[PDB]
């Protein structure tokens, strides 16, 4: 049913970003009529927005009142991917997080509530689906903002029939995640965004991979192209008011991540890994991909090896530009 | 309670119903100073006493200049501001967010630097658990109240802000003024809650608009008990903790109406129906046992006594209450 999006008008809030740019690429592949990207480039690079006849780019916050007022009821689908990137940035400035991570969703939904052409509004939430949450689980304002967007998604559906679908995912990696993308957001994580691109960049430079705690921790990585397809499946076939895990169902240890990256890149430097013991990942739960498979026919099948090969090829091909982007934060990094 | 003697206290939302009662009790307790911060969005200035120990900032707590001007000179902060209430919030979720979610966040973001604070008490909505459903929330107001609990837990864990969440519901008593504040979009601005609506109507000798035979029950709690409960939270509540401040006693709306009529001498009819098992089934009231055990707090004002006090206050102030109600006449007529 991904062809349901053929010849439709789509908005992608946060569409200049990592997941967003990949979603935009896939929408254009599927033959959408128009993509309206709304993105303030707070954590993104304009090089991730194509200069394409189906792509309209509004370089403005989705909280901007004038922008919101200017929106017309001409969208079939909306993908809400904006966030304040990410955990560490949000701890550093909870008010910057609120503006770009909680208020975004509320103001977007308040404008959309009277749009009648809307078939689905897909919200990227953070990471068997249950709708019970703990007040204690939340390590950052980012994590609270993500949860709050689910509260809003449920409310706008119940009260106003906004056809929301919540897509939960975690540990996305792949082409288009640029270290240093966007503005300085307070901490070194602006540069070193996530473990996979940090390790790829370091391995391409022939640097030893800074492996923490022997790399015993595991993550369910998911390739960004699979996430894009999962978000599309939610739009086309997800139940309004509903939620879906968009997940690989496969765990990789950080040590094995490092090893694969080193092997593919030919980075012949040491790795300080340790054997996993029963106490190392004992509490850990990963999201089941079963609901999305059963109800949407969606399966995230790109293997970690194939995904890493693609990501590494893209990173190598763009290494100079990535480095120019990272370097803009040299001063802020030095004084942190 | 006397732990607060001679302390400096801030009451955000201190001009409102619960707030004004809390401020009165704090003064009785002999606090050094109360700083009330209130934009009067749902409140009346006559609920702010002229008293040498009260300072009044007629300003939103989200105002940056006000926040920046605050100094680390408070022993206790009571955060009572909200966007009153469910109905208003549904009408305008953005007005709610500004006065109900953003309030908490910006307040906490300022206070996290303050090391004189012993306790920060947040009035949340109604054994205590910290698990919530994404589905339980009928309104933006409801979401904002829950969000404030999330923030309270976070700021304690991350920044050691000594928060205590106080959960209550169905407060009634002197100082709740029908029509208080600005028009917030719906007739609930006037007809705020069932108790003051019924008291007012009974005093005017009008039939009480009892809905569905009054089979619904509520755990009403008298406002002075809520104020003492908040104080017990401040003095002795565990940082990061939560306590139900509750009566543990249910009254049907039909019995509420009957009592109000009996006290006021309102001789008009009442359409009551008998309560059946399927009428309140599964409705849960908050246990007051944790607050009793840990803080020695119990809410002992009976419904009969509280209603008497409330009716007396209303009768005493009926003229001013009506003048306050009447400012919303045009807005009511067009709703
Ligand atoms: N990458 C992951 O592993 C991961 C995991 C779980 C959930 N998510 C969610 O997926 C979404 C996309 O994340 P990402 O990894 O692509 O990060 P990203 O930072 O690359 O993308 C987010 C985009 O939002 C934009 N933005 C920020 N504030 C805005 C505002 N006020 N108005 C409009 N646009 C704004 C940024 O400039 C950026 O382009 C986010 O909602 C994120 O929380 C991501
Ligand atoms: N009355 C009840 O039965 C009840 C039940 C459960 C929880 N509560 C909570 O108790 C607290 C007090 O409620 P109340 O019944 O006294 O209502 P209220 O409306 O009388 O008091 C709230 C006060 O907050 C003020 N306020 C609004 N926005 C503000 C802002 N931006 N900055 C500063 N002040 C602002 C209002 O002007 C008002 O004086 C609220 O937090 C409410 O959610 C009340
Ligand atoms: O430079 C890095 C960055 C992260 N990680 C590991 O990668 C996992 C996920 O990283 P995140 O920063 O998201 O926490 C954790 O187990 C980290 O210890 C690592 O070994 N080296
Ligand atoms: O004018 C009124 C206002 C409310 N109620 C009842 O009082 C209870 C609580 O009212 P609320 O407005 O809080 O909902 C409910 O069972 C209502 O039906 C009523 O009978 N008449």
Author numbering:
A (entry chain A): 6 to 132, 147 to 355
B (entry chain B): 7 to 132, 147 to 355
What do the paper's sentences say?
The abrogation or reduction of O-antigen expression as a result of wbmF, wbmG or wbmH mutations implicates all three genes in the biosynthesis of this molecule, and is consistent with the hypothesis that these three adjacent SDR genes catalyse the UDP-d-ManNAc3NAcA to UDP-l-GalNAc3NAcA conversion, which is probably required for O-antigen synthesis.
UDP density to the α-phosphate is also visible in the WbmF/NAD/UDP ternary complex. The UMP density in this structure and the chemistry of its interaction with the protein suggests that this protein, like WbmG and WbmH, recognises a UDP-sugar substrate. In both structures the β-phosphate is coordinated by a conserved arginine, although the precise location of this phosphate is different in the two structures and both are inconsistent with the β-phosphate positions of bound substrate in the structure of a D128N, E129Q mutant of dTDP-glucose 4,6-dehydratase, DesIV, from S. venezuelae. In WbmF, this interaction involves Glu231. Cys133 is disordered in all of our WbmF crystals, indicating that an element of induced fit may be required to bring all of the active-site components into place.
